Amino acid sequence: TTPEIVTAWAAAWTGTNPNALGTLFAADGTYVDHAIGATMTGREQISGWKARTDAMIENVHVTITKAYRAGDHVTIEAVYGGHIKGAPTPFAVPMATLLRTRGEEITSDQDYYSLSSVLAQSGLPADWTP
Amino acid sequence: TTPEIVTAWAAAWTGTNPNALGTLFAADGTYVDHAIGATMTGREQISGWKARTDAMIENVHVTITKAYRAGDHVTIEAVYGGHIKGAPTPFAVPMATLLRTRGEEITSDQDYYSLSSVLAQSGLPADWTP
């Protein structure tokens, strides 16, 4: 079924502890969010990204539609939801996450989704920023 | 090592014959672009999607940076580039394409990328529509 690393990754994002995200990564792990264009390096910056995300978005949740592994590469099809603080409405958008692993740890995470969809569903202007 | 179907898929998108895209799919194959929210079903609609894309964007090209197969799933990490007609500048954005195959045919293609990056790099307003 679902690789354990995927379950853990979704729990870390859906949970309320920033360190739970960072602890899944190796010391040299990288995290890139392609919708926002943000790159984090190392466990502390990664955990900080979950913290920052929660600062701006309430009730963030990531649910797994499906995931598959090919050796040390893992692909995840997920739905990313939440409510941007102050926004008229919540959002739920499709997202793909590509992980590279080493042993039990993540060395690279890339998240692909469209920010335009998040904003549009949220009832925010298309050019909106925090 | 890149699956043959991946090379064909990229050539199809990068060439000018729109039918090159639909020929790669099974009769019941589906195509979903998550950035635009467009769903196409069957060969005729899929080839029509390449034609529609070419009508609004010149020099459409998809470049493969990596691809890996897990059973009937194939994950592609790519760069989608081109130049929206009338835009002051071109674009090149990271994209993830998730394919499902049956034999040598594609039964599913889902494309994940951020429309906002495409528009911003193009010099276009975030609410731009064709």
Residue numbers in the entry:
A (entry chain A), B (entry chain B): 2 to 131
From the study:
Caci_0382 is one of these genes, which encodes for a 134 amino-acid putative protein with a molecular weight of 14.3 kDa. While the exact function of Caci_0382 is not known, sequence comparison suggests that the protein belongs to the nuclear transport factor 2 (NTF2) superfamily. The three-dimensional crystal structure of Caci_0382 from Catenulispora acidiphila, described here, reveals that the protein forms a homodimer, wherein each subunit contains the NTF2 conserved structural fold with a similar binding site to LEH. The protein structure characterization suggests that the Caci_0382 structure is similar to LEH and that it shares a similar binding cavity with a conserved group of residues implicated in LEH catalytic activity.
The most prominent hit was TMA, for which the Tm shift reaches 16 °C at 100 mM. We determined a crystal structure of Caci_0382 with one of those compounds—trimethylamine (TMA). Structural comparison reveals that the Caci_0382 structure in apo-form and in complex with TMA are very similar and could be aligned with an average RMSD value of 0.4 Å for individual subunits (131 Cα atoms). Two TMA molecules are bound in this predominantly hydrophobic pocket in the structure of Caci_0382 in complex with TMA. All interactions of the TMA2 with Caci_0382 are hydrophobic and van der Waals. The three CH3 groups of the ligand point to hydrophobic protein side chains: V61, V63, M96, and to the side chain of Y81. The nitrogen NE1 atom of TMA2 makes hydrogen bonds through a water molecule with the OD2 atoms of residues D34 and D112, and with the NE1 atom of W50. The position of the water molecule that makes hydrogen bonds to D34, D112 and W50 in the Caci_0382 binding site could be a hydrolytic water and D34 a general acid catalyst as both are conserved in the LEH structure and play an important role in catalysis. The Caci_0382 complex structure with TMA sheds light on a likely function of this hypothetical protein whereby it could be implicated in TMA metabolism in Catenulispora acidiphila.
